[PDB]
Structure 1
Amino acid sequence: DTTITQNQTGYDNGYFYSFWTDAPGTVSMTLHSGGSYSTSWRNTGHFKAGKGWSTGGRRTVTYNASFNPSGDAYLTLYGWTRNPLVSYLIVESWGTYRPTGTYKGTVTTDGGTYDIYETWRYNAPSIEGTRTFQIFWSVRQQKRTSGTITIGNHFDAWARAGMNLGSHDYQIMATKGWQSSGSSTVSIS
C-alpha cells in the first residue's frame, strides 16, 4: 500500500482523500483497499486525514474503525462549507479531550444521542485562508467506533439551532489529532 506524508488531496481506490499536518513526517496515512486508510502518528502537531468526498452532502455513511489515540484525537465525519464558511465535525470517538463549545441542544440519530455545540475561530486558518468562521459540532455522548451516520439528521438539528451551512466543500471520515501519538484504521462504506 501507498503511504502519504505530504500534504495533499487526491483519489484512491474510488474515494477522495485528504491529508494535512503542520508537523510533516511525524504522521503518515496509508491508503488501503476501497474506502479504507490507516494513520500512524508519533509526537505530532496537528493533523487531519481521511477518505470521503470532494463535495459533501446529506449522505448516509457507514464506517468501521480501529481507533487508538494515546492523547488528544478525534474519529469524526469532518467537512467544510463556503458562504457561509463553516467547518463541521460529527465526533464519534475521542481520546483524552472531549470537544465542546457553546451548548446548542442535542440530536438523537443512528442509535446514539449527540450534544450539539458551536465554536468560533478568529483570524484562523481555513479552506479560504485566514478567516473568522463557525465550527458546528455533534459530539456523541458516549464513544463509538463503528456504525452509520445519517448526516442530514445532524445538518437539520444544527439548522433548528440556528447553525446554518453553506455550499459544500470536502467531507471526509477523518482521524484528527493534536500532539502525542497513536494510530487508526478507518473504513467507509
Structure 2
Amino acid sequence: AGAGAGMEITSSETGTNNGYYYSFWTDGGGQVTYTNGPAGQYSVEWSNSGNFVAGKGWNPGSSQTITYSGEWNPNGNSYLSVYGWTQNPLVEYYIVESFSTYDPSTGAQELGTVETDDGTYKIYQTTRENAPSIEGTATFNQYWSVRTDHRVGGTVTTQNHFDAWKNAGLEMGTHNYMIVATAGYQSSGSASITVQ
C-alpha cells in the first residue's frame, strides 16, 4: 500500500475495514506487524514469529469465488490460504495455495483430491485438541485442501472445495469468517495481499 497502509497493529484484533472483514491473530511470539490498506489490501511483516494468522475477507463467509493478488515473501514456515471457520460443528479449514518449508498435512491420511481453478488439491482432515479457536480453547477438526502446484494469486472457487470435503465425509457447520490469510510459525517474512 506504500503510504496507504493504516496504523500498525501488533496484537490480535478483528474488525471491518473498507468493507472487508479482517482478522489478525498472533500468539505474541517475536514481532508481527499487520496493516490494513485500501479496499481489500493488507500487509503483514514478521520476525522470529510465534504462531500467527492474518488476512481480509468476509464474516460470515458465504462460499463465494475469491480472487486475490499480491506477493508473499516468507523466510521459513508460512502458508498462504483461503482460511476460515464453521461453527456447530466447530471446524477450522484451509485451502492452501502455497506453503514454504513445511507441509501442514503431514501425518494425515489423504482423503482424495479435487480439481478446481486450474490446479489439483489433496484433501486431508486433522484434529486440534485444547487449542485456540474462535470460541476459545477448544477441540475441533481441521480440513485441508493443499494445492499440488504452489502459486501466489488466482481464483479460488471455495464451493468446489466445500463440496469435495463433504463428499469425503467431512461435515461443515454454519459459516463464520472466511479470509485470504497469511500464516506463519517460527519464521520471518512479509506479504502484501489484496482480496478483490
Q: Give TM class, smaller chain.
A: over 0.9
Q: Structure 2, unaligned stretches of length 5 or more?
A: none
TM-score (structure 2 length as normaliser) = 0.93
Post-superposition offset of 1:25: 6.5
Q: Residue 102 of structure 1: CA displacement?
A: 2.4
- Say yes or no: does 1:12 pair with 2:3: no
Q: How far apart are residue 24 of structure 1 and its match?
A: 6.0
Q: Quick check: 1:126 aligned with 2:133?
A: yes
Tell me the equivalent position of 1:67.
Answer: 72
Q: CA RMSD in A?
A: 1.1
**Identity over the aligned pairs, expressed in percent?**
54
User: Of the candidates 16, 32, 36, which is equivalent to residue 37 of structure 2?
Assistant: 32
8 Å contact kept, 1:173–1:188:
yes
Name the aligned partner's letter for residue 161 of structure 1: A
The match for 2:144 among 137, 141, 145 is: 137
What do residues 8-52 of structure 1 show as CA deviations (whole Å, max 9, x unaligned)?
111111211111101266001121111011110001101011000
Q: Distance in 2 between matches of 1:123 and 1:30?
A: 30
Which residue does 1:87 correspond to in 2?
A: 92
Confirm whether residue 154 of structure 1 aligns to residue 172 of structure 2.
no
Deviates more, 1:146-155 or 1:20-29: 20-29
Moved over 4 A (4+): none
CA contact (8 A) 1:5 1:24 kept: no
AA at the equivalent of 1:143: H
Q: How far did residue 143 of structure 1 move?
A: 0.5
Mapped partners of 2:25, 2:136: distance in 1: 15
Q: How many residues align?
A: 189
Conserved? CA contact 1:51–1:174, under 8 Å: yes
Structure 1: gaps spanning 5 or more residues: none
1:165 matched to 2:142 = no
Q: 8 Å contact 1:45–1:178 — kept in the other structure?
A: yes
| Structure 1 CA distance for aligned equivalents of residues 132 and 22 of structure 2 | 20
Instruction: Give me the whole-angstrom Cα distance separating, in 1, the residues matched to 2:161 and 2:45.
Output: 29
- TM-score (normalizing by structure 1): 0.97
